[PDB]
Write a protein that binds this ligand. Structure first.
Ligand SMILES: [Mg+2]
Ligand SMILES: [Mg+2]
Lengths: 257, 255
DNA sequence: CGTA
């Protein structure tokens, strides 16, 4: 019947761990948990963090130490786990997990931040290209798909507090926002906007200006589903009172047979 | 050529676990000035109080494990004063005023205002009491060296993140203006008369590689009265010494 | 991400 999925950029898993991540996790009780920015060598993580009771866990670390990484905890045996799009440039930064849960594929993606370089804005845009290709291929083969994670782009003006101030800042460039339009036009739905059309709804806030108190944030974290599957979506929400990282978690609930 | 070193040590027992004792003989100043001793000096090692070649002087706070200043000297002063004659300022282990005849040395751990409005207010009034003190000594004709942790970076050049910190104590317009007012009473920031570059810092946050990335503040200073500035040979930041969140700073004077 |  009901399956709950949570996505969370954790800005460091052992950092969030010292702040009581496990207490939060055991309280929230997702059936599947997607995490971005683990940043730790998974094989030397606390055992109580790798083996949480009732879950199987999967870590996909970057090649660079202390950088990126994603993880998934699941109560549902996956029938398959893939950790890349099959393009080495993109598959080495610890950004990709694709799990087969029979009814749907689950993509847990840490999409690149394009602020550091002109070439990281390029890397980002090309990761975007490669992701759309991958998901489209799986979808066109008859698979339902759920994509969650940190897209690193606010879509519409509704999705950041200062839209006009950032129109030349990565995360809100016309190029970036245009790809999300294109992504959607390929048959995918922004699930939060299926149920909530309000401004103010953010998932990231700068640590400075102490922006979170002020609610001066960006919606950088999304659950997307393919159109064909959108009737199984019952809930899509932001867990805005969950602290510990510069991102808050997002939740999805699907009703399934 | 007399060399003075000023170092906020974030605890004298914590830094003792690094070979501060080995640094201190591996780098032998005429006068060593230490801020934030954080310890009952009678429960400090015999070898930590009584160093060979040095008379040591500890000015501890009333509060346990808090604040405190120390001075190690080859030539002992003729007097040591430990307060401005203002009670709430004189009980926090913040003040050493040593008469070396040829000059007075102020070894001051200035309050930090970051924790509350009351402590910011306290830091600012401490700023006033000190200025009155040093103005009075300077007016009696004395040559004055003032060293230690001011807990304020004066100008944007003196910290890595001026913009996000302009509402943080350590970089308020009220704190920066007092450094203006102090200098304009006829006192000289010694470092800035030899080095005018950015990225010159004495403190770095422990949190987030800060030092290894050089995100720091210049919070430690050597100041002299205007008249006396002619005798300052060198003023430098000992950027590479470790074991505290502050690094040492150095002064070489001629006579 | 470094200001605690
Ligand atoms: Mg991050
Ligand atoms: Mg300290």
């Amino acid at each position: 019947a009901v399956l709950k999925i949570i996505s969370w950029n954790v800005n460091g898993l052992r950092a969030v761990h010292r702040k009581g991540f496990l207490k939060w996790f055991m309280e929230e009780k997702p059936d599947i948990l997607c995490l971005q920015e683990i940043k730790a060598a998974p094989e030397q993580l606390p055992r109580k963090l790798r083996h949480v009771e009732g879950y199987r866990s999967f870590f996909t670390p970057a090649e660079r130490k202390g950088y990126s990484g994603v993880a998934m905890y699941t109560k549902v045996p996956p029938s398959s786990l893939r950790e890349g799009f099959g393009v080495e440039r993109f598959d080495t930064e610890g950004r990709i997990q694709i799990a087969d849960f029979d009814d749907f594929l689950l993509y847990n993606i840490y999409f690149p931040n394009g602020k550091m370089s002109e070439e990281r804005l390029k890397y980002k845009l090309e990761f975007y290209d490669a992701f759309l290709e991958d998901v489209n291929r799986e979808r066109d083969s008859g698979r339902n798909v759920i994509i969650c994670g940190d897209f690193n782009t606010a879509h519409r003006e509704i999705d950041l507090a200062r839209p006009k101030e950032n129109s030349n800042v990565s995360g809100f460039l016309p190029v970036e926002r245009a790809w999300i339009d294109k992504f959607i036009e390929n048959g995918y739905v922004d699930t939060f906007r299926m149920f909530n059309s309000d401004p103010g709804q953010y998932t990231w806030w700068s640590y400075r200006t102490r922006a979170r108190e002020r609610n001066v944030g960006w919606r950088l974290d999304y659950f997307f589903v393919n159109e064909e599957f959108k009737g199984k979506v019952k809930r899509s929400w932001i867990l805005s009172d969950v602290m510990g990282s510069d991102h808050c978690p997002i939740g999805l609930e699907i009703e399934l047979l």
